[PDB]
C-alpha cells in the first residue's frame, strides 16, 4: 500500500532475480528481496534467520556484514533508505 521506485543499487538487486519494473509496492520489494536471499543462498543453512552478506551486493545495500530476519526495524529502514516513495 506504498508505491516505491527503488534507487539504482536496490533495483540492481531486484533485477538480479528477474524484476522488470520501475515501480513496486513495498510488499513486492520485500518479496523480491527475500527471493534474492534464497536464490543466492545468503541465509545460514542451520539457523536460517541469519543472513551473511559481507561479500555481496546486499551487504553494500545494508552497510553491514550480516543481519537477522528478526531485525524488522533494520530491514525496513535499509529498504526505505534505498527507494523513493510515490506520494
Amino acid at each position: 500500500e506504498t508505491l516505491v521506485r527503488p534507487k539504482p543499487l536496490l533495483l540492481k538487486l531486484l533485477k538480479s532475480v528477474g524484476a522488470q519494473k520501475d515501480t513496486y509496492t513495498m510488499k513486492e520489494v520485500l518479496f523480491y528481496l527475500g527471493q534474492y536471499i534464497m536464490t543466492k543462498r545468503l541465509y545460514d543453512e542451520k539457523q536460517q534467520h541469519i543472513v551473511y552478506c559481507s561479500n555481496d551486493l546486499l551487504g553494500d545495500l545494508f552497510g553491514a556484514p550480516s543481519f537477522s530476519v528478526k531485525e524488522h526495524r533494520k530491514i525496513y529502514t535499509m529498504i526505505y533508505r534505498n527507494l523513493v516513495v510515490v506520494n
Partner: peptide, 10 residues
C-alpha cells in the same frame, strides 16, 4: 524453520 518461513512474520 526455513528462511522462507522466517521472511514471509518481514
Amino acid at each position: 524453520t526455513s528462511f522462507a518461513e522466517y521472511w514471509x512474520x518481514x
